[PDB]
């Protein structure tokens, strides 16, 4: 089932067989679709764009040899459906680029598909004749779980240092699920500590001229579980991420949005290779900060949806 | 000002 949007003049139509295009970590799926007796100029253009500033822009014309990218499976079915005035187009989406993710009021990055007619790009478009689509490059959790993302710190003061010991079930979590934070401190110190603070913070990397980072919590529980000195403590906690308890937090990262929607929080999205190459746009991720109050440990975890069936 | 993104199935 292909979405179609038709131009104000009613001449032009653009087809995209979907707009939640997948990524495989190694490569991003190329866009494909179907775009003159009105536009006597006898030519049409597809422009694929990501915009936050347009991060990247590419241009192709389905109508009327150097663009003969071989016809994709569903796209040929579309041509056969439409006939003589139907012409294929496709885009090699470059990797090293974001997914569709937005900011809480759509702000953030967005992918714009603009199909229009003209004699050449140098000529200005007319709203009377184009179709504008918005799309979502999206990425789903690896099938391979990470390590049990344990972290420890024997915070030293009391000759026997205070021990902070922490574990989760997974680095790779599904969205809307709890996190079974499982912690085992050892308070062999000569003092008491009253409150253990369990939190999840969204960290959001943004870069357009410099690497900018901004963070705020999206899951919280306060545990007054005072651990006495010369004592070790053991119980599992439970946080869970959801956007309702934080609607007031301006600029918090949310998932892709087409025009206006309450699609849930922004999913963390992966880097490519071990190169840590500085991708432009938005990257976010989550860590479980458990902090014993003075009288801290974080366990990194990727959060994103499972692979849709 | 008044386009629409209806669907179509081949």
């Amino acid at each position, epitope marked *: 089932r292909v979405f179609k949007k038709a131009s104000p003049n009613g001449k032009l139509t653009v087809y995209l067989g979907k707009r939640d295009f997948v990524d495989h970590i190694d490569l991003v799926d190329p866009v494909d679709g179907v775009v003159p007796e009105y536009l006597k100029e006898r030519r049409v253009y597809v422009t694929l764009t990501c915009a936050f500033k347009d991060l990247f822009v590419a241009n192709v014309q389905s109508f009327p040899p150097e663009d003969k990218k071989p016809l994709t499976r569903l796209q040929e079915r579309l041509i056969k459906k439409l006939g003589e005035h139907a012409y294929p187009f496709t885009f090699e989406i470059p990797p090293n680029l974001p997914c569709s993710v937005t900011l809480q009021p759509a702000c953030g990055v967005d992918y714009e598909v603009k199909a229009f007619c003209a004699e050449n790009l140098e000529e200005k478009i007319h709203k009377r004749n184009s179709v504008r689509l918005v799309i979502r490059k999206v990425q789903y959790a690896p099938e391979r779980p990470g390590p049990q993302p344990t972290a420890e710190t024997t915070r030293q003061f009391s000759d026997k240092p205070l021990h902070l010991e922490a574990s989760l079930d997974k680095e790779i979590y599904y*969205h*809307g699920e709890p996190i079974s934070v499982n912690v085992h401190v050892t308070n062999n110190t000569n003092k008491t500590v009253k409150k253990i603070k369990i939190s999840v913070r969204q960290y959001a990397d943004i870069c357009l001229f410099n690497t900018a980072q901004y963070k705020c919590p999206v899951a919280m529980e306060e545990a007054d579980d005072t651990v006495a000195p010369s004592s070790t403590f053991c119980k599992v906690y439970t946080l869970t991420p*959801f956007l309702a308890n934080n609607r007031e937090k301006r600029g918090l990262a949310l998932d892709g949005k087409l025009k206006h929607e309450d699609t*849930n929080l922004a999913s963390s999205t992966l880097l490519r290779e071990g190169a840590n190459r500085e991708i432009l746009g938005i990257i976010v991720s989550y860590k479980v900060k458990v902090k014993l109050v003075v009288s801290a440990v974080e366990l990194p975890f990727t959060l994103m949806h499972p692979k849709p069936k | 000002s008044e386009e629409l993104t209806r669907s179509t199935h081949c």
Partner: antibody
Amino acid sequence: VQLVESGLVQPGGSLRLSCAASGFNVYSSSIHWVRQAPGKGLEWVASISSYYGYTYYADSVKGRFTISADTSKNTAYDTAVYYCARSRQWYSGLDYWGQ
Amino acid sequence: DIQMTQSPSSLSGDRVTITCRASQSVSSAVAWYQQKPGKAPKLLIYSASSLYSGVPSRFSGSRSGTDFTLTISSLEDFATYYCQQYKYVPVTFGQGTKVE
């Protein structure tokens, strides 16, 4: 994994319905209720996906009923059976069902 | 309120199919449920085509425009079956079709 619920009263009376699942969690749930008169069809009364904090109600009951989710024990709260139900967070039909 | 409606009302391993009518465009937002009276519904189909886990292969979701439908290619299937609609809030189950 299971879902269960709980909670005869004269016209003008009141009730406190409650439903509990096991093996899985509330926030993975758009908490619906649905009812059925004997030998008849099926009708959505109210839903709450606390994930967004929106309570949805049917026109037939608007404003009378109130729906809320007991997050702390994996639980949420006209002669007809009453079902507490769950759907995903995407919505792909009511897939976990109470007794 | 999409007054989605369902036919046939009833009928008696044999192949069968059931159809519902949407009052407006509702995209793929349909479901199908098999209920034995006295038991809670269990989901068969999502987005009018996709078989849910563990469902027998007999249950194939079908569509033609605002025509949604179901094909049980072979009839425990003497049971009540509901279509659905959910693109717009509120949802609206239909009158349901039994089998014998």
